[PDB]
């Protein structure tokens, strides 16, 4: 009845763990129950990730739910590829087809490339952060030569937080040499709130500018500060709060005590945490299908040292790979399904434009269909003051005597 | 393999690393204080206990593109070798008016 | 030395003295002048342009 799994959590991911505990209760049946082993470690320090993964492998788990950084993603994917241990993660998908990895996050590269094609953009900025892999930068650069775009890629990541006022004021001075009015922000939801505040300081948020937040949590970050400046701000949202499924989840979420569940007494939830809740439903339904298929998975004994040479992989991991990669359930991230590689398939990302009345569901895409929502007859603002410019020269435009 | 040498008790490790495996060595040697001496491409950032024989080529490439007075050119790169240098010429493409 | 996944991480003392000796080496070789900074990157080096 006790199924052992390993948890690798970043120390600063409290809400991302609060959603994990809630998922344990919602999908707990009387047939069995999952037993987590949680290790809070530094996600960037890959030696700690190596020390943590091998801790769970010595305790003999069956799957591992965790995260990884750019500095540590290869450590996870290469151990799981040899030891045939299944890894479930909400971090960015691995740049390639790696077995025994269950990537809960969908691939955003297909979204951004067509949101650009929708607005008919041919020259824009792209401030990226390498903390989540250079997968998307190679996407915009490869398609920049095919469509003959004129793109400026700036590794805004490696910047110190003490000289941030003088350097951020210096980045926009370079972008002014082409008078760039179309920017794509590709940082995590933290550094975006840093750039957003520095955009307001220099006033580059009025009529004319048009930003595109490139992460799956447009509503997660704060938008009310660049809402009324007049700049059009697009984005992407994966947690559709309109669905009655999420609204059922949000209602129970908004009421839990914040001391036992940090970062949980609000009406919204970050796309990282929401994917975590939807991960438990993947794992629970994966083992339940092993039961119904009459498959025996419990370890024959001690897995031994992960550094065993030659590395002997336990065979039942393949059945766990095929069990997790063949789950198909419905959760907060909409539809959930995986291919033979563990990548998100058959999914749906909603597109969001920020207007005067707040975030507005405008569009959506799919790995088969691109930019289909037409249209948003509901909501609407019906408020548009057209800006007309002219020059003071008689008698065309003269200031009245009074 | 880094552990097969620590058990044997080496006092320093000469080797190489890839784009995918560089972070494994940099953080391992950082915690276990083993000294790594390698020619493999220099660490993107300051990682202690690593000796890079490879001199920083990216600083030399920028100076060369200036002397030739280029404005628009193609840059070919393989994601296998990496792109720490292509990143360097894409960051400096706005200040110095390059259409890469 | 034992295992590399030693918990807690026991860092031997003489490793920090080895790091200091390496970067303090200043000799001449096939690459030109070889001296290092406190991080381990080449300084006072020479790249020919051909
Ligand atoms: C794809 O998603 C649709 C909509 O949820 C679902 O009805 C269908 O069964 C899925 N197809 C496959 C092959 O999983
Ligand atoms: C710097 O390199 C030159 C060329 O090899 C050498 O003559 C000089 O002594 C070096 N500087 C120092 C401080 O050793």
UniProtKB/Swiss-Prot annotation, chain B:
Record's protein name: Glutamate receptor 2
Superkingdom as given in the UniProt entry: Eukaryota
Post-translational modifications: Palmitoylated. Depalmitoylated upon L-glutamate stimulation.
Notes on the domains: The M4 transmembrane segment mediates tetramerization and is required for cell surface expression.
Job description of the protein: Ionotropic glutamate receptor that functions as a ligand-gated cation channel, gated by L-glutamate and glutamatergic agonists such as alpha-amino-3-hydroxy-5-methyl-4-isoxazolepropionic acid (AMPA), quisqualic acid, and kainic acid. L-glutamate acts as an excitatory neurotransmitter at many synapses in the central nervous system and plays an important role in fast excitatory synaptic transmission.
Organism: Rattus norvegicus (Rat)
Free-text tissue specificity from the UniProt record: Detected in forebrain. Detected in dendrites of neuronal cells. Expressed in the pyramidal cell layers of CA1 and CA3 and in the granule cell layer of the dentate gyrus.
Entry's family note: Belongs to the glutamate-gated ion channel (TC 1.A.10.1) family. GRIA2 subfamily.
Additional note from the record: The postsynaptic actions of L-glutamate are mediated by a variety of receptors that are named according to their selective agonists. This receptor binds AMPA (quisqualate) > L-glutamate > kainate.
Range of the intact protein held here: 76 to 175 of 883
Upregulating conditions: Down-regulated in the pyramidal cell layer of CA1 in the hippocampus by global ischemia.
Subcellular location: Cell membrane; Postsynaptic cell membrane; Postsynaptic density membrane
Description of how the protein assembles with itself and partners: Homotetramer or heterotetramer of pore-forming glutamate receptor subunits. Tetramers may be formed by the dimerization of dimers. May interact with MPP4. Forms a ternary complex with GRIP1 and CSPG4. Interacts with ATAD1 in an ATP-dependent manner. ATAD1-catalyzed ATP hydrolysis disrupts binding to ATAD1 and to GRIP1 and leads to AMPAR complex disassembly. Interacts with GRIP2. Interacts with GRIP1. Interacts with NSF via its C-terminus. Interacts with CACNG2, PICK1 and GRIP2. Interacts with GRIA1 and SYNDIG1. Part of a complex containing GRIA2, NSF and NAPA and/or NAPB.
UniProtKB/Swiss-Prot annotation, chain C:
Tissue: Detected in forebrain. Detected in dendrites of neuronal cells. Expressed in the pyramidal cell layers of CA1 and CA3 and in the granule cell layer of the dentate gyrus.
Induction: Down-regulated in the pyramidal cell layer of CA1 in the hippocampus by global ischemia.
Domain of life where this protein originates: Eukaryota
Glycan attachment residues as annotated in the record: 44
Post-translational note: Palmitoylated. Depalmitoylated upon L-glutamate stimulation. Ubiquitinated by RNF167, leading to its degradation.
Subcellular location: Cell membrane; Postsynaptic cell membrane; Postsynaptic density membrane
Record's function text: Ionotropic glutamate receptor that functions as a ligand-gated cation channel, gated by L-glutamate and glutamatergic agonists such as alpha-amino-3-hydroxy-5-methyl-4-isoxazolepropionic acid (AMPA), quisqualic acid, and kainic acid. L-glutamate acts as an excitatory neurotransmitter at many synapses in the central nervous system and plays an important role in fast excitatory synaptic transmission.
Note: The postsynaptic actions of L-glutamate are mediated by a variety of receptors that are named according to their selective agonists. This receptor binds AMPA (quisqualate) > L-glutamate > kainate.
Membership in a protein family: Belongs to the glutamate-gated ion channel (TC 1.A.10.1) family. GRIA2 subfamily.
Subunit field text: Homotetramer or heterotetramer of pore-forming glutamate receptor subunits. Tetramers may be formed by the dimerization of dimers. May interact with MPP4. Forms a ternary complex with GRIP1 and CSPG4. Interacts with ATAD1 in an ATP-dependent manner. ATAD1-catalyzed ATP hydrolysis disrupts binding to ATAD1 and to GRIP1 and leads to AMPAR complex disassembly. Interacts with GRIP2. Interacts with GRIP1. Interacts with NSF via its C-terminus. Interacts with CACNG2, PICK1 and GRIP2. Interacts with GRIA1 and SYNDIG1. Part of a complex containing GRIA2, NSF and NAPA and/or NAPB.
Domain notes: The M4 transmembrane segment mediates tetramerization and is required for cell surface expression.
Name under which the protein is recorded: Glutamate receptor 2
UniProt lineage: Eukaryota, Metazoa, Chordata, Craniata, Vertebrata
């Amino acid at each position: 009845n006790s199924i052992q799994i390993g948890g690798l959590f970043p120390r600063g991911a409290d809400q991302e763990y609060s959603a994990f505990r809630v998922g344990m209760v919602q999908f707990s049946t009387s047939e069995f129950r999952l037993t987590p082993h949680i290790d809070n470690l530094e996600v960037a320090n890959s030696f700690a990730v190596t020390n943590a993964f091998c801790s769970q492998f010595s305790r003999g788990v069956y799957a591992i739910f965790g995260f990884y950084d750019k500095k540590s993603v290869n450590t996870i994917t290469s151990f799981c590829g040899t030891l045939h241990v299944s890894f479930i993660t909400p971090s960015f998908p691995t740049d390639g087809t790696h077995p025994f990895v269950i990537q809960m996050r969908p691939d955003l590269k297909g979204a951004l490339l067509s949101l650009i094609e929708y607005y008919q953009w041919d020259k824009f900025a792209y401030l990226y952060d390498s903390d989540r892999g250079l997968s998307t930068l190679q996407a915009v650069l490869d398609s920049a030569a095919e469509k003959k775009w004129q793109v400026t890629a700036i590794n805004v990541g490696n910047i110190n937080n003490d000289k941030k006022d003088e350097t951020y004021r210096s980045l926009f001075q370079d972008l002014e040499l082409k008078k760039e009015r179309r920017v794509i922000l590709d940082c995590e939801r933290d550094k975006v709130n840093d750039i957003v505040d520095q955009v307001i300081t220099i006033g580059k948020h009025v009529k004319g500018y048009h930003y595109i937040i490139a992460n799956l949590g447009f509503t997660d970050g704060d938008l009310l500060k660049i809402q009324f400046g007049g700049a059009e701000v697009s984005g992407f949202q994966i947690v559709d709060y309109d669905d009655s499924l999420v609204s059922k989840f949000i209602e129970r979420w908004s009421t839990l005590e914040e001391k036992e569940y940090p970062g949980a007494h609000t009406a919204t939830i970050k796309y990282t945490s929401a994917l975590t809740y939807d991960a438990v439903q993947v794992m629970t339904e994966a083992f339940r299908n092993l039961r119904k298929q009459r498959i025996e998975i419990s370890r024959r004994g001690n897995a031994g040292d992960c550094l065993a040479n030659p590395a002997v992989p336990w065979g039942q991991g393949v059945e766990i790979e095929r069990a997790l990669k063949q789950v198909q359930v419905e959760g907060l991230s909409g539809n959930i399904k995986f291919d033979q590689n563990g990548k998100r398939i058959n999914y749906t990302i909603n597109i969001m434009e920020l207007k005067t009345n707040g975030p507005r569901k405008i569009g959506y895409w799919s790995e088969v269909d691109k930019m289909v929502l037409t249209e948003d007859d509901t909501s609407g603002l019906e408020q548009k003051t057209v800006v007309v410019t002219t020059i003071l020269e008689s008698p065309y435009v003269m200031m009245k005597k009074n």
